[PDB]
Amino acid sequence: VETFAFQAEIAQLMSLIINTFYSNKEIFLRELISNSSDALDKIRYESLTDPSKLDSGKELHINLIPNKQDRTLTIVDTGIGMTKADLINNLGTIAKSGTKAFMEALQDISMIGQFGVGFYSAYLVAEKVTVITKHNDDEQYAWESSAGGSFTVRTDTGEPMGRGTKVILHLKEDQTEYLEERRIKEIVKKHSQFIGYPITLFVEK
Amino acid sequence: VETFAFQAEIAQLMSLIINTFYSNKEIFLRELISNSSDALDKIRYESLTDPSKLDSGKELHINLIPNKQDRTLTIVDTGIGMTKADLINNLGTIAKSGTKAFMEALQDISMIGQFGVGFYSAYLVAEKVTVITKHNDDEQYAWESSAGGSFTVRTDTGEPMGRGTKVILHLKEDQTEYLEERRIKEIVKKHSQFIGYPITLFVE
Numbered sequence: 001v002e003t004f005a006f007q008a009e010i011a012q013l014m015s016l017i018i019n020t021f022y023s024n025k026e027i028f029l030r031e032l033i034s035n036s037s038d039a040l041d042k043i044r045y046e047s048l049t050d051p052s053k054l055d056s057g058k059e060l061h062i063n064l065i066p067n068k069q070d071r072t073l074t075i076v077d078t079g080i081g082m083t084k085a086d087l088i089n090n091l092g093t094i095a096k097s098g099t100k101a102f103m104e105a106l107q108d109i110s111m112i113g114q115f116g117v118g119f120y121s122a123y124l125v126a127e128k129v130t131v132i133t134k135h136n137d138d139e140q141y142a143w144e145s146s147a148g149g150s151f152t153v154r155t156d157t158g159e160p161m162g163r164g165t166k167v168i169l170h171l172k173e174d175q176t177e178y179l180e181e182r183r184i185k186e187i188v189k190k191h192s193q194f195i196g197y198p199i200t201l202f203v204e205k
Numbered sequence: 206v207e208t209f210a211f212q213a214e215i216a217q218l219m220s221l222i223i224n225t226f227y228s229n230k231e232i233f234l235r236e237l238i239s240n241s242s243d244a245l246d247k248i249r250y251e252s253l254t255d256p257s258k259l260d261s262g263k264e265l266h267i268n269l270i271p272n273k274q275d276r277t278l279t280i281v282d283t284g285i286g287m288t289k290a291d292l293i294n295n296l297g298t299i300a301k302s303g304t305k306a307f308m309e310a311l312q313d314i315s316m317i318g319q320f321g322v323g324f325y326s327a328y329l330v331a332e333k334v335t336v337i338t339k340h341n342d343d344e345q346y347a348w349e350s351s352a353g354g355s356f357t358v359r360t361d362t363g364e365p366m367g368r369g370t371k372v373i374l375h376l377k378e379d380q381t382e383y384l385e386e387r388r389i390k391e392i393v394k395k396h397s398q399f400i401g402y403p404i405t406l407f408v409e
């Protein structure tokens with residue numbers, strides 16, 4: 001288990017997201033699904049020149065898995081995944097000028113996605129976020145942060161995932177509506193209706 | 206014809222795009238198709254609760270029309286379109302904060318789209334851009350700029366388009382590769398392959 005400091009502007013953005021009231025919190029689900037769709041585009045693109053890219057799983061889909069008992073909402077996709085370097089250095093698409101431009105714009109939250117930092121909208125609803133991921137060129141890894149300016153990365157020893165990413169939202173006690181089948185369906189319908197991959201809700205036992 | 210000053214940061218971005226060398230200029234086509242797709246999503250959504258939104262045209266598609274004779278590449282869609290207010294005031298999504306700071310990311314051009322200003326990438330390859338558009342709530346208008354700090358807006362009493370937008374790129378003389386059928390196919394394949402509306406390339 002290695003522990004890292006957030007890039008300064010990411011820490012600032014995270015505090016802003018957590019410590020300020022925003023009405024329109026449902027957009028977190030749109031942003032996560034958007035990222036999953038972009039990850040699916042990426043592996044599909046690679047698979048057109050080299051079909052062996054799909055040895056790790058041919059299916060291209062997004063699954064939403066609410067769990068009232070654990071107070072978790074999980075977004076799973078079979079996209080390209082992230083390597084250890086991605087998890088430690090951050091993605092190329094998250095640049096500090098974009099992070100800065102968004103925060104300036106803040107002072108609607110929904111504009112977050114435009115600037116490449118949509119993932120951090122998860123902290124509108126989640127007290128902790130766990131990201132389990134597997135990229136064809138690397139091993140399976142877990143990234144986790146409860147904000148407060150640090151995050152962790154470790155090799156993952158849980159269930160193998162083949163290829164793709166699970167983001168596990170450990171929800172805030174006042175944000176449990178997002179575990180409700182009805183609410184989830186309404187949000188997907190409003191914001192993610194024309195995404196070009198199946199989105200399937202796994203109804204809880 | 207009314208002539209309008211560009212917002213100051215928009216003028217600066219435009220001068221920058223025109224007056225700086227960039228290698229990977231082909232991404233302009235990715236940005237335009239992305240906007241057309243976003244505009245298609247918008248009218249589609251509206252039509253779900255009001256079917257009459259499609260009385261101006263049921264088809265939801267994107268057309269690419271190269272014209273070697275006129276040296277123009279036109280990107281046409283049947284998306285939601287833009288009102289006169291949109292054309293004069295700009296879109297609410299193009300914000301000083303994103304414009305001022307995309308320049309900061311530059312100080313690759315390809316991340317322009319992030320910052321909400323993907324359209325202006327048209328000026329990597331075009332000396333003039335004409336935008337003809339029709340929204341359900343307004344008349345048909347033409348916006349046009351050759352840069353130099355201004356744009357014009359006029360009623361378009363030309364060809365009725367029903368609903369949607371045409372972006373006509375009047376290409377610089379050293380940028381004519383973007384009228385070649387095979388170059389356009391390759392750009393679509395690399396960047397826009399999984400857009401969720403038909404993209405039709407119309408032989409001249």
Ligand SMILES: CC[C@@H](C)Nc1cc(C(=O)N[C@@H]2C[C@H]3CC[C@@H](C2)N3c2ccc(C(=O)C3CC3)cn2)c(C)cc1C(N)=O
Binds near residue numbers: 010088
């Ligand atoms: C595959 C790429 C993309 C198309 N999709 C996704 C993108 C993301 C996403 O934003 N991850 C990251 C990288 C990691 C995991 C969450 C957050 C942002 N992290 C980090 C990592 C590091 C830092 C730092 O300050 C380092 C000091 C510099 C900050 N933050 C996610 C989570 C999923 C998908 C998807 N479902 O596939």
Ligand SMILES: CC[C@@H](C)Nc1cc(C(=O)N[C@H]2C[C@H]3CC[C@@H](C2)N3c2ccc(C(=O)C3CC3)cn2)c(C)cc1C(N)=O
Binds near residue numbers: 284372
């Ligand atoms: C429907 C909106 C979006 C989803 N799609 C599109 C967006 C655009 C686009 O960016 N247009 C604008 C508004 C007009 C036309 C081009 C440029 C950017 N203009 C202006 C207008 C004004 C200003 C100013 O400085 C004013 C002083 C404040 C600057 N620039 C386009 C072109 C097409 C689509 C699409 N195919 O539908």
